[PDB]
């Protein structure tokens, strides 16, 4: 009967769909590698999909995936065991070296652009008509690290312009230069901004941006990577 036919066909459709979904989800990160970066012998039962090409919006070119995978950066880790499956220990300072929870990827060293081809993220002072709308304005607040010491003062908010959202606090340090802190990694309080992930002495080490009115994708990855890594690697100094 038609209902047995239908359910029979459906199971076949579903297996095909899962097969399609799994291979689509292999457009990044494959082939699988050994710990030394050479191709693993066992790739699984799904082969790679035929490549697709995205056309990028502002003369920025295309992306074709799957394609040749490569970290494009040194990775300061070494094996801790003589067989596969164990951790790899930082060979230096994992925060400065950008490994473990402090990792960053080699994204393009250009800012994300909005639909009109303008920089998506800007310091509020350079963003016409933007202002604090609701909530405690953090600008001017002292910034406190997990060691309960003051690391600097908030001098601006970096806003997402098309999405009208706060993305970073710009924080000025004792020596007069500034750093960006991810909004998601700060707690705005009535009399301070509190930064759980970093002790005061780690603020100087936040990666800097090469131009003071824009951030590149590569820069945001280094900053966000570095601050999140403090949760594991400051932790000695953090005192709750």
């Amino acid at each position: 009967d038609l209902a047995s036919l239908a359910i029979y066909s459906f199971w076949i459709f579903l297996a095909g769909l899962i097969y399609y979904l799994q291979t689509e989800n292999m457009r990044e990160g494959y082939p699988l590698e050994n710990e030394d970066g050479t191709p693993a012998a066992n790739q699984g039962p799904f082969p790679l999909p035929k490549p697709k090409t995205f056309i990028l919006p502002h003369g920025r070119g295309t992306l074709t995936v799957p394609g040749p995978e490569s970290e494009d950066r040194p990775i300061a880790l070494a094996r801790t065991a003589v067989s596969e499956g164990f951790p790899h220990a930082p060979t230096g300072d994992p925060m400065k070296d950008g490994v473990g929870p402090a990792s960053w990827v080699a994204r393009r060293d250009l800012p994300e652009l909005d639909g009109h081809g303008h920089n998506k993220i800007k310091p509020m002072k350079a963003a016409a008509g933007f202002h604090v709308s609701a909530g405690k304005n953090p600008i001017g607040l002292p910034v406190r690290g997990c060691d309960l010491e003051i690391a600097g003062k908030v001098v601006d908010i970096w806003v997402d312009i098309p999405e009208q959202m706060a993305r970073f606090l710009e924080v000025e340090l004792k020596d007069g230069s500034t750093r960006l802190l991810p909004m998601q990694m700060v707690k705005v309080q009535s009399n301070r901004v509190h930064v759980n992930a970093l002790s005061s002495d780690l603020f100087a080490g936040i990666p800097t941006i090469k131009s003071p009115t824009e951030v590149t994708l590569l820069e945001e990855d280094k900053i966000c990577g570095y601050v999140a890594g403090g949760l594991m690697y400051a932790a000695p100094k953090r005192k709750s």
Partner: protein, 281 residues
């Protein structure tokens, strides 16, 4: 064994228990103390189900059913073959779910990410425990829990719902369904929106999140935004489960009659209770 970008994240650290003892991977899988705990609980639970299968005289996955103690046992322990195995398997399952959540926390700590996922998973666990632990304890018997069997557990759903008439009339259940439906709606829209932007018309450039807000604003006059939609899906699906748990914790405890009759409170509000006409006058 590793994704092309994976090695830089496989550093030591983040475990909650045991230091470096279980800090390793088996192929793609992280272990950790709680991987070991979950293996233990899951393996024991599965073995006890297998034993249960042999005591019931079947290997057929569609016949295997593990039943809780009959109502007469109340909340005491029952002989293995008369609900005892269900009791132990339940403890194994709870151990395995909670271990699984705690292993997720270990993975979050290693990766330097927030804890949103195990926190979300904890709602599913609380729904499970409402059905097999909190509801049965409040009602005074393990036998109020559902049996572990593919088909028999649907028997339980059906028998339990009709114990209260048409279960659609449970107001917490209406709220729960609304979140489930709204959630699936939001999932469809979210997957579609992003894909429609990453996969424009043939030969066009990828769209931007600005085109996403634009499309929604054009369509319904409002866009939630790319952060908003993920907050929203998390909230719809956890609310669905929260209200599911709620709709059962109250059923058989504070309300145990035909759910349809609950609605008479509204109909009988004294200011309109007696006006003739309508359906109820």
């Amino acid at each position: 064994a590793l994704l092309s970008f994976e090695r830089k994240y496989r550093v030591p650290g983040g475990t909650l228990v045991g230091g470096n003892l279980f800090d390793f991977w088996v192929g793609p899988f992280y272990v950790g103390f709680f991987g070991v705990a979950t293996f233990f609980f899951a393996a024991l639970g599965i073995i006890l189900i297998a034993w249960s299968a042999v005591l019931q005289g079947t290997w057929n996955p569609q016949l295997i059913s593990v039943y809780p103690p009959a109502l007469e046992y109340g909340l005491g322990g029952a002989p293995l073959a008369k609900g005892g195995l269900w009791q132990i398997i339940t403890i194994c399952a709870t151990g395995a779910f909670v271990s699984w959540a705690l292993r997720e926390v270990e993975i979050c700590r290693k990766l330097g990410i927030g804890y949103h996922i195990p926190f979300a998973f904890a709602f599913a666990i609380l729904a499970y425990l409402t059905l097999v632990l909190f509801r049965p304890v409040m009602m005074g018997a393990w036998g109020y829990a559902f049996p572990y069997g593919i088909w028999t557990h649907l028997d339980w759903v059906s028998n339990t719902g009709y114990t209260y008439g048409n279960f659609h009339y449970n107001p917490a259940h209406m709220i729960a369904i609304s979140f489930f439906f709204t959630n699936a709606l939001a999932l469809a829209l979210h997957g579609a929106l992003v894909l429609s932007a990453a996969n424009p018309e043939k030969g066009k450039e990828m769209r931007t999140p600005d085109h996403e807000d634009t499309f929604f604003r054009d369509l319904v006059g409002y866009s939630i935004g790319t952060l908003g939609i993920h907050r929203l899906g998390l909230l719809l699906s956890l609310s669905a489960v929260f209200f599911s748990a709620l709709c059962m914790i109250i059923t058989g405890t504070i309300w145990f009659d035909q759910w349809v009759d609950w609605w008479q409170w509204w109909v009988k509000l004294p200011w309109w209770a007696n006006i003739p006409g309508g359906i109820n006058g």
